[PDB]
Structures are given as structure tokens and as C-alpha cells.
Symmetry: D2
Subunit: 419 residues, 4 copies
Amino acid sequence: MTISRTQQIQQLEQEWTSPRWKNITRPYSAEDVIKLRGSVNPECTFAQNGAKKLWELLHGGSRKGYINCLGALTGGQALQQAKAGVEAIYMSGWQVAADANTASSMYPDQSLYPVDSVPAVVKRINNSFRRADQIQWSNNIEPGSKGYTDYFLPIVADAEAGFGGVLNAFELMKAMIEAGAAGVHFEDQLAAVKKCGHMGGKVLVPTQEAIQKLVAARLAADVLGVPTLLIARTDADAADLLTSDCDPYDREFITGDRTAEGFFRTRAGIEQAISRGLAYAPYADLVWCETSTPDLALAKRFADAVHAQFPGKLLAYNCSPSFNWKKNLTDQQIASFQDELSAMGYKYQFITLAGIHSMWFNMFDLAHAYAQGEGMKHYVEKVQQPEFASVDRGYTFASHQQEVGTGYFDKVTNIIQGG
Amino acid sequence: TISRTQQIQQLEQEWTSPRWKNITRPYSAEDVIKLRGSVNPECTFAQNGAKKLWELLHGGSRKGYINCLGALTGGQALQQAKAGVEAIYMSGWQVAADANTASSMYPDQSLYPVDSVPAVVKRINNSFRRADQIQWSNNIEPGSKGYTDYFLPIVADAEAGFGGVLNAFELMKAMIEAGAAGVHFEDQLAAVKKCGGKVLVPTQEAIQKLVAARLAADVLGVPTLLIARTDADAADLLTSDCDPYDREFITGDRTAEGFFRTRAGIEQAISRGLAYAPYADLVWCETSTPDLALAKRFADAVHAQFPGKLLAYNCSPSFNWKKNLTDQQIASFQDELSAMGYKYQFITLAGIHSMWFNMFDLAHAYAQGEGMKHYVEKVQQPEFASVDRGYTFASHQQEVGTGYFDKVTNIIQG
Amino acid sequence: MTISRTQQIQQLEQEWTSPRWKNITRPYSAEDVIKLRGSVNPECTFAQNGAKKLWELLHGGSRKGYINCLGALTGGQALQQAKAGVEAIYMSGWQVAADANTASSMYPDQSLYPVDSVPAVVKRINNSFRRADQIQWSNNIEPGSKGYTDYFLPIVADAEAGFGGVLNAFELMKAMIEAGAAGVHFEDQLAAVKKCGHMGGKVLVPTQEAIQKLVAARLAADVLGVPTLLIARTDADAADLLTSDCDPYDREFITGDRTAEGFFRTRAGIEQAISRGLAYAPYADLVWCETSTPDLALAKRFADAVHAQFPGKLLAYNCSPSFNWKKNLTDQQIASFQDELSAMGYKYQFITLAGIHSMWFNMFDLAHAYAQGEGMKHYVEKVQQPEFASVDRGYTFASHQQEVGTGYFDKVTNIIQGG
Amino acid sequence: TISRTQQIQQLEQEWTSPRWKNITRPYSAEDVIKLRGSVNPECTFAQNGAKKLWELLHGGSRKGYINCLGALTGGQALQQAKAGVEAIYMSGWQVAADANTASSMYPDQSLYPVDSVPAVVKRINNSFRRADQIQWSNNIEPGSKGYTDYFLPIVADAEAGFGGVLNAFELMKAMIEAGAAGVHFEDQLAAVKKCGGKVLVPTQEAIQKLVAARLAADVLGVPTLLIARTDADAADLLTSDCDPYDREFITGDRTAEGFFRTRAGIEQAISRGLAYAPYADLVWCETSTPDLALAKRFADAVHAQFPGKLLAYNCSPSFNWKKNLTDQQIASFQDELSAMGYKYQFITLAGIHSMWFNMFDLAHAYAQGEGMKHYVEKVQQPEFASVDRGYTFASHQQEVGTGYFDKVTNIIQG
């Protein structure tokens, strides 16, 4: 049955009454969304599937009661995470800046790479998943059977602050969805003006401007018709600078001091972060207070404050890869950290830079020994034997040709050529 | 002002230098200049890489041979440089699997777009460039305490050139423009790999691909290393019997496809190696089974006709070393190859195994729970313990250029 | 309702009994196709719509009884064709080689550019159509109303000979479909070995090898589940060389002479082309005899021979942009040429290089005058005034800001910002 | 061997050359060398382009001014070269519309990815390169009958640098690496264009972007032309009042967004032009309405403080020339601008209008029927008639390199 424009509007209005959209504010109409959709709205299968799966995982479907992730910067890394039992992929903008962007360059984390970069790697990941799934399906290995992997993990992707204005955010959100992201995060700092020096640091935008970026992102998702998870990050815990005092909501944090650039000094900390989290909560599915120092007490303060106004709100938490865990916490505290966060409502947790540290450290570790001599000894000891020892854990890449689809394409060849 | 006569004379003179001893070119200097245009953009990375690689192969390597590990990201290559590695190997198999411009995962059958390997070569040189910018910005120059020469020569896989002689010509140019120091071409045709085995092209066609590649390098004016790979050790099929040189290996039997069956093995490999030697700077017999006896046979045969010829050797990442060789043999393997004249050695898939295994290893424990314990035990603490070995990435912000760009910002802002 | 693997096979078997697939041979099973599909088969909306529309146009839906096309090398060129009333886009590999490939280089037509190039431009075209449609929809301009354009023209794309082996063809076909092509053509020459010199020229592959490329392409489309039009081109009219004599079907054309490369000389001409067309007909939706010299008599011979075995078979015809039409044909013959071809069953006709000649000639024409002086006089006379004079023909680009979506994005901005 | 002291001295010396008269740099030679690294890859196209453009602007142009037409493909640029044009204009609006790396159609609001304009600059230089290879392969060199210098300098649109000073710095480097001869930056912020009008940034922030760009060029060691565009003629909004220099134009009124209302017009444009002059090689007052009187006002004011300053001027493709000016005024317009010191003039959207109109024109007739009649009348016959003007593309195979690659094939095959 053909679906008329009026029917599209009605169906959208109906969808917004479903449990998925409970407590979510949209400052525009269904009619407005359909006005932007065009007469043909190409389907985004990976994004639809990812968003639905991520929602399920966030609400009781996960194995541990929370989702824990590790930043992946190649499709193959993501694939190994799936094989290993990880339930969702974290896609880090920092890692993409460093070693996987479309400028083919190494950058620090300041929104320097071209805006198509993160969507490009999301696509890479979904293609690795797709080939792995094709291999599995071609051998009729089914869910519940030994050796089965559900390869299509939802991908949560870093959109920075949207690379400019509301339209840049709108376009980037669409690109994430088209690439197949399940969730996307936006933050309220402006990387472009990050202040250099000892009295520098991150700079926030007014709350109203951060809210408008979230509205732009939700609009993009609504126009495409995909219930993508939207995560609002605040940098207000550490950021003691603000571009403009134009939003009265921010006034209580302004100290009066200005920078040479004209920025306003603010009182950074948990209170400012709470202010931002409360403001963003109606416009996002999850709220995230960026933290450089893992601290359960502060995590509890943030969660309690948000939940006092927004009971049950889903929260995200980044677990620092640079914080010296052993030096600052007991082994018991380290082992229980993510569990403890989960009980507070942090249901999406991640180590942003895990993949790049994993890759870079282990490349170094092998290379340093190998370069000195007895090369094969070191390859065998550091790589080949440990691989063999992981077969019982579900590692399959010792069988390298099948892993990348040699058997799959042999089947294709055979089907083409007959027999 | 350099007239054409002058350019031709200059090229003819260059070909008399030590670099070109025993190398055959079936075309003229005039031919090369004809293709050059009036403007020839400089390829700095490729010039530096080719010169450095030649030096390493003639007395410059620490161990007397160069040993490499396939890298598939710029950051992997950078960490190898930090670790003391002298050259980078750039694997087509790894690019097919996890680093190509189709953004897809492929087996090793020339399925990815032809710009893929050059794209990763470019990535690597950019990682090297930033690392060098970082040290230089902190007053570290060649000769300074703490200086690392980050610009390792890169040797890159061109497969069989992705079609005909012009495809090989274009791919070679793209490798050089991206900054490769050396490039290898092989004599199998992936497109018709039988479900079966590998299929060779006639010797004359493989030579034509080598000629195409050398011509590209000559036109650009870069002394890129050219490596000739033969797949004749295992390939027992041949597309055509048109080259009388291949006659002795043909059995007479033909497949349904029309291929010619051949007697695969060390003798066919030797035949190909001898044929390619006059065109290439190194020859390589692709081997699936590490075997010093066969390596000695190949080297002996080549060196009987081409004394001192540089040889390359691939050390299999899938062969079960411990099961089939003693620990002593494993430890001495690359050294023993060197004594036979194998001066460029590499593990093609080292980088992808390194990356994929360790990702799995961390992820599997992390997914079970106690997540931070596993990150600390498997990654953070081992990083800390490698600081004395020269590992610097625990200082993660400086590593990727945060300090460098801070300096840029400060200079702009005054 | 969830669709099981068995149901997917049954549905495919059922689809192959429909009118779309009458007279089409597949040397593999539905079970084999599903084996390669994976558990998730992402939707290709533009390709589905394009393929269905192209089939309709080919069977009575076109305005003139045949579809006539002009090679387009930018999305904007394709957009102007749609505005002008053209019903399908031709996507030329020659034009892509010259001025629109992913190597960013200028190449002759010898399969030198990277294999992702033609899909990349197909994507560009569909995105231009998409934005134009979004603009139209946002202003509620509907079919049948004045000023309405159905922007989503089916795109027919040049896949050369698939860039290698059967798997390269398989992958390229998938890339075309994912980009949104409605139809794709493959040819039976091997560009890689095109013989240089006066006694050189195009080289054919054995008929069986050309058939296998068509099977590979159909398999790809079947796996993706899109009824993409498949066009088999033969180069046998002019090609008097053949790579191998291994197919007994080709024996009658072999002369006995060999080249230095080992190629076999053949008797080129209409008979060899007919042989190839007859062989490919069961494995393609259209057959195309590449022609350098427009000749109605030869076109009739080819059509009659194909139709003697395959009544009603759809045929394609390329109309040479380099042939000197006025010198060789009367004005009456020139004006009626495409009409006459249509009556013979050539329902898809195209000038491969029209877009590049259009672009390059007119850039030259303006530049040559402009460079000499009185610059604005020449811009006004050659461009601006002629544009104004075309408004009544439906040309809208004098209103340049709206054309590219300024009004559309203003609506987006307004919706985001409220009001 | 060139020490840092030597490199710094060399740079300091270069800044004393005629090229750098009246140019202000708020940073030191030491600062520049600090960012350069130990290896600085050559950018041949950018070096040649910048030198040639400087020559054209100081006595080399045929007419005493350079006039340009925006090009959005390499082939368009090549045809301009064939037609006698002296330089290429590279429009961001056209890239947004029909030639960006997002493969999408956008309005002119900095929506495309930042690598887009450099990508098309690369395409253009490659078209130029092949055209030159073709002529050279046929024994046509500078001085030969039939020689064309295909390597026209390219002036490219960098918008407002896509974010902060580091984004501008990186974009400038990418322009140079692709081979641009000149680059322009503007003082509006597209991201917040009000639905309303254009919005300016403070003068100091626009200057910082110019400094960032010059620094990038200095670090790479290329004397790229830097053009400062102001949008202050039409922009009546300002993001911030932080620069006291902008005070006189601020009205006091503020918008809901927090912007400052300003008095737009020629005086605000003059203010910006005077402020940017010490940093840029040319200044440009963006104009929507061709008006010689206003052009004279802007030029007069700038030249009163900066005698001889090179000016650029955009000639609107949408202004209704015939309706508003006499044919005589239209014909003399660019010449009259030249007398005022506007030495770089361009129609930004000429290429896209040329391409899109003529595609429509052919398609509309062709779709109606009698298809070949229309192709012959609109394209083929007009091409034939332009052979005496230097149009060569009727010979379509040679134009794109068929003869060149035939020569390559023949050389490889012997």
C-alpha cells in the first residue's frame, strides 16, 4: 500500500507516543520533519538494526546489566571484539584523529580531521561485521549453536561538536546514520578555540547553543526515520571557560573575568556539569559527564542530581585510559569499578582509547624484540603461541584465510563456475 | 635551462652509476624522457626512502640483513620506528583484510581498488612526518640525544599490477608518489586462482610487468627498489604456453579452463628467478614452508649466474614453527637466511596478527567483567614497564602532536 | 513476520517465475543465492526504484517509445538532464576515465582508473537527484503540477569488463547497486591487452569467459535482491583479436594467424558480433553491439538475427559522438536516426560522450572570448542571456541559490531554531 | 648540511626580497623553522604556481589585469588553458554544489568536508600535467610551435578556514600540497548565517586566520598568494564586540542570538580592507552589485594608506547586467576595474553555469526527439567551427592521453 504524505505525518506522530520516546522533548512538529524528508527516503538497514539492538541492550538485554566498550579504530578490531563477546562498539574521535581519518594524517584531538572521517570508519566496521556474518551464514552456523557470533554490534560514534553550526551537526548526524551508527554523541565544548597555555583549557558554548546541536541531531534522525541513540556529553567538569554569557542559564557560573579572546571564566566542577546534564536530559537518550579522574563519589553526585529530576535516566561514563589506576585505587576498587558505576545507572561505559593503546603497545612490544635479532623466536613467543592458546576462548584468526572470507569467496567462485 | 638532449645525456650518465650495475633496461634514455613532460614534480619521500633502502642493503643494516613486520596503519609503522625497526613492510594481504579504499574485508585475490596500498603508504609517511615534526619542535635534530630517524623506507606490495602493463605502470607511479622506497610484483594471476591453486603467467609477461614498473620509476626519476616475486614454487598451472622459456615445465595436460599444467617446485621457481634477475633489484621465491634447504637451493642457483644478487624471503606467520623446528632453529632462522644472501626478510602478516590477537585478548576478559582490572593488567601496566625500552605512548597526547599543535597555536596568537 | 532462510529461498524461486525474468537463464540455484546473502541484507532503495522504473520505461512507459540518453559525468549534469525531460542517465566509463575518477587523473579508455570510480559518480548523481527532490517536496510541488520533475532517473552504468576476474565483476556489480545504479553493462574485450600500432586494436575474450562475467553480475544482483538491468556489450564488430581459442564456439571466426603475444586473429564484423549477441542473450536483459559507424542496415541485420532466435529481445545502441554525421548522412537521415533504430527494437540508445563534449566545448567557447577582453560582454551573451531565454523551457538555474538547496537548508535551520 | 641557525638565517634573508615588501608577520623566522621538521617535502606545483601568479600580477598579464572563470573539473580548467586563459579561479560555491568529497549537493554555507577544494585543485593540476605530457611526447616543448603552458596558477577558495586557526593552518597546507598558487579567506561566519544575513567575526579574529595561513605557507616554504576577503559591505551582524577596532560600526542593538548589529556598507568594508592589507597580498571587497563608484571608493581608501596594493574583484554571475548597464558599460567593466587597481578579477560561478546551462539546452531538445540533429547542431558542428580558435577536443582520443599511453605501451613492449 502506498503511503501518503499525510500518512507519513500520522505514523510519525504515532511513533512518538511509543515507549522508545518517553520523556523526550522535540521542539518541532511531525509535519516539519516530513517536510524535510523528500519523496524517497532511502533505507538505512544497519542503523535501524543497531539502534533497536542498542535500546534493548540498554534496558535489560545486556549480559552484565551494563554495556562496556573499548574504542575501535579498524573494522578488524571491532570484529575481534565481537568474537570476544563485547556487546557494542565505541567509536572514538580521538583515535580517528590519531590514526584513522580521511586526511591520512596524525592529529591531536581538536576537530582537525575532515568531517567524513568518523562515518568512514563506522562504514568499515559494519563491512567487517557483514563479511563475518556472510561467512557464518554460508556455513549455516546458527544462533544458539557452538561457535556462533552475533556480529552486528551496535556502534556508538563520536560526533565531536558537529564541526560548525547546527547544519554541520545535522549533516554529520545523517552521515553517521547512513554509515550505520546505532548511537551518536555531541559535546558542549568548542575545540576550535581550546586555549593554549597553563591558564588555558577547554571552552564551553552557551547551554542554549549546546541544546540546539542536540535538536539538530534529533531532527536529522527523525527525518531519516531512524531511532538512533543520542548522547549528550558535557565538558563542564573541567572547562572553566565559556564563549559567551548570552544564556541566563549559565550566569550563576560566570566569575566576571574575561580572556584576551573575550571568553568568560566560569567555576568548573561537578555543579557546572550537573547544570549542563540537567539542561540536556530532555533532549538526549543518555547524558555523559566527561571525566578525567575516575571517582565513584563524584559519579554518584552526578547521577543522583540528574535522577532527582529525571528518574531512571540512562547515563554514560568514560573510563580514563591515562589515569594511573593501580597508583590511585586498590586492586579491589579497580576490579569492581564498572560494576559500581552500573548500579548508579551508568549503563553505557567505555575506554575511549583502548583500541589504539592495544594496537600501538603490542606493535612496539613485538618490534622492539624482533629488531634486535632472533626474530622468529619473538614472533612465535609473542604472537603465534598466544594465539594457539586462545582457540578455546573462541579466537579463530589462527585460521587466517577463512577469517577474511577466503572460504566465502571460494563459494562465490564455485557457484559462478557451476560444477 | 635543461634541453632535451641535456636531460637524455644526464639520464644516460645516471645509468652508469653503481646503483644500476647489472640492471637491464630494454628501452632508451630518449624513450624515458619522451614520457616525462616538461614539469616533473618532486617526490621527496620516495627519493629519501629509495636512497636509504639501498644503503641498508649494502652495509647499512645493523645485523647484516633487514627484517620487517607488515604494518597496516601509520601508527603501527610509527611504533616500529620507535622500537628500532629499520624498514617497513607493506602487505597487500593486510590491506585486503583491513585497510583498503573499498572499506571492506577481502581475502587475498586482488579484489580491492588499486589506490589502496598507495593510500596506506601515504598514511605511514604522514605518521613519520608528524613524529619528526614533534621532535624537531623540541630541538631534537639528527645528532641530538633522543633523535630517531622516523622516515623508514617502505617496501610495498603491488600484487601483479592490477591488469596490464599500463596498470602496473600507473600503480608504480602511485607507489612512488605516496613515498614507497621499494615495490614488489609477482607472476601469478589472482583473478583465475583455481578452486586448484595459483596460476602463473608466461615468463615474458612477468618480465613485461617488471619493465613497466622500472619505466615508471625512471620517468619519475626515482631509484625505487624493484623486487621480483615468483609464485612458481607452488603454482602448477600456467595461463599460456606462448613463452618457449617455460616449455620444460609444461606437462602437456590442459585444464577445462584451458590452462597448462606445469611441474611446480624449486626448479620452476629457479627458472623464474633467473629470468627476472636482470630486471629487478631483488628476487624473491614465495614460500609457504620455511625450509633452509630449499632456500639454499634457490640462492645457490641464482648466485651461480648472478653473483651477489640481493634476495628477499617471506617468513610464514601461519607455519607452526614450534611444532616443526627446534627453538634453536627458530631463533637462528633469519640469521641463517642472511648468510645465504637473503638480505630483505619479512613477516607479511605480523601487524594484523599483532593487532587482531591483542584486541581479542583484551576484549574477551573485559567482556566477562572486572573490566578495568583487565585493561590495567593487559595494557596500562605493560606500557609503563616498556618506558625504558623507548615506548613513549603512555604520554598519549604528545605522541599524536598535541604539543606540536599547541606550539602552532601559540605562534599564531603571539 | 520474520522471514526464515527457507522462506527466502522460496520467495526467490517464486520471483524467478515472474514476467521480469521471462527467458532469462541462471546456471545456479535459489539456494546458492541465499547461501551468499548473509543474515542481514541491507536495503538498496535507489537501486530498487531505478531498476523497476527502467523496466517500465523499456516496456511502454517512455515518452517516445525508446529511451535516449546522454553521458553525464557530474550529479549536476544529470540533474539538468532530469529538468530537461530526459528519462534515464547514461554513465560513461570513458568520461569517468577522462575527468571524473578516484585517481583524480586524466586517462584514456583502457580500464586504468580505480574500480570504485564509476560507483562513486553514480552516488553523486543520486545525491543531486535526492537534494532536488527534497527541495521540491519541501515546497509541496506534486506530480502532474506545473514545474514538477520526477528527479530519480534510472542510471545505466559502464562496468567495463569487471576489472579482472569473475570476483572482480561480482564486487563491481554490487558496488554499482549499492551506489544506486538501475542497470549495468559488461563487455567482452580485454582493455589491458589492447594492441598498440596500426595492426593492433581491441582484443576479445572467449565467449565462455564473457558469459561467466554476465553470470557473476547476475549473481551479485540476485544476492542483493535487486532486479538490476544487465546489459551485455559485444566488441566483436571491430575486434579482430581473441585472447584464446579454448571455446569451440569461437572457432569459426579464427583465421589461424597468431600475434607475438599469442593472441588469435579473427574475422571481425557483423557475423562475429551476431555470434556474441546470440550467446549473451540468455544471460542479459539487453544486448548491445558496440558500433563506431552508425549504420541502419547493419543495425537491422544485428536485430533481425538476434530476434530470429530471441523474439522481442531488448537491444541497446550507442550513437557515436565522433562520427561525422553531416558529412555522411543527410539532415533527414540524421533527424530520424534514433526513431528508425527504435522501430528495430533498440529501446535503450545513448551518446556516450555527450556530457563531456557539452562541458568541454562550452567552457572553451566562453573562455576563448573572455580571455581576449570585454569579459562581461561574453559572459552575458554566451551564458546569462541564453539562460534567461530558457526559463519557459523549464530551466531554473538562473535562480542559482534555490537550485542547490539554499531554501531547503533555510527550512532546516528554521525548524531547528524554532520560531 | 643545513643547521637550524642556517635555515633561520636563510628564511630571514628571503623575507627581505621584493616578494615580501610591506607584508607583516607577527612571528619570527625561528618560530617558522621550529614547525618545519627535519624533512620538508617539495611542493613543485605550488612553487611554480605562486611564482607565475606573482609575475602575472606584476607586468606579466596580457591585458594588465588577470580575468578568471570558476572551474569545477580538471577538464574545464584544461579547456580554459587551451582557450588562452592565464589563471584558474577555484570556487567554493561550485565545489559545494557539484564537486565535493561528500558527493552531495550543498548551498554555500561551509557544509562540505574540508578536503574538498584541495581535491579539485589536485584534479586540475593532473589534467594540466597530462596535457603537458601529451605535447612533450610529441616533441612540443617551451618555444616550440604549438606549445601551450598548461600549468596555470590556481587561486582557491578556503572560505573562513573551517573552524579555528588550526583548521585554517591545515587547510592552507592542503591547498599548497595540492598545488594552489593563491588562497583566499573571508571574515564571515557561515555557520551562523541568520535567516537575517551574513555575520562577521571581529577584525582581530579575521587577522588571526590570515596569520595562520601565512604561517602554513612559510612553514612549507612556498610564497603562496594570500587574498583577504571582507564580507563587510553587506554583513550587518557581528559575533562579538571584543575588538575595539570594530567599535565605530556597532549600533548597540543585539539580536536574540547575542550578535551585535553593525552599520554595513562601504565604510565597514574599507575598515576591514585596511586592517587586512598588512597581512595579505591582495584584498577583496565581496560585492553582490557591480558598481564602479563603490569600487572606486574602496580602492581609493585602501590606496591612500597602502599605495599600489593589489586588489581583487568578483564579477557577479547573477546580477542582471543587460538590464542595469549599457552594452558599452558591460564591455568596458573589467578594463575600468583594472585602472583602479583591481588586478585579479573573476566570475565565481562561470563554470557551473556554463556546464549546467548547456547540459539543459542540449538535453531539452534531445528529449523531444530528432536526437542526433540536436547533438550535431548544438555540439558537433560548433566544435568543428572552433578548430581555428585552438579547440582540439574533436580529436577526443588524443585529448585525454590515448596517444601518450600508446607510446608508453610501445616503449614497454619494445
